[model samples]
Target: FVNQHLCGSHLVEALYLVCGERGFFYTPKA
Candidate 1:
């Protein structure tokens, strides 16, 4: 459980960084 939480936290942090760099309105168009 500790390992899972640690990994999940890291994943969220990385995702947040990417989202911040891309801006909240950024999206992929088909």
Candidate 2:
């Protein structure tokens, strides 16, 4: 249970970083 929470937290962090720079990687076709 603890491990799952840790994994989820990290996953959220990664997603946050990805979205934090939104409009940077956007492509007209992407």
Candidate 3:
């Protein structure tokens, strides 16, 4: 199941959501 998968900046401060092509694509912000 797809979820609010977090990544970047130790999963905090800077985070990203994954949703596409087997989680190949993502967007990050800090």
Query: Which candidate has the top score in lDDT?
Result: 1
Residue 3, model 1, lDDT? 45
Q: After superposition, how far is residue 5 of candidate 3 from its true place, in Å?
A: 0.3
Task: Assess the local accuracy of residue 25 in candidate 1 as a C-alpha lDDT between 0 and 100.
Answer: 40
Ranking by lDDT: 1, 2, 3
lDDT per residue (tens digit) for residues 1-30 in model 3: 234564565444322334324344335541
Candidate 1 ranges beyond 4 A from true positions:
1-6, 21-30
Cα lDDT for residue 30, candidate 1: 18
lDDT of 1 at 21: 67
Clashing pairs in 2: none
Question: What is the lDDT, from 0 to 100, of the residue 10 in candidate 2?
Answer: 68
Q: What is the lDDT of candidate 1?
A: 0.51
Worst 10 residues of 1 by lDDT: 21-30
Q: Can you give the lDDT of residue 7 in candidate 1?
A: 43
Query: What's the lDDT of the predicted structure labeled candidate 2?
Result: 0.50
Per-residue alpha-carbon lDDT of model 1 for 1-30, expressed as tens digits?
224443455655655766876754423341
RMSD of each: 8.0, 8.6, 6.9
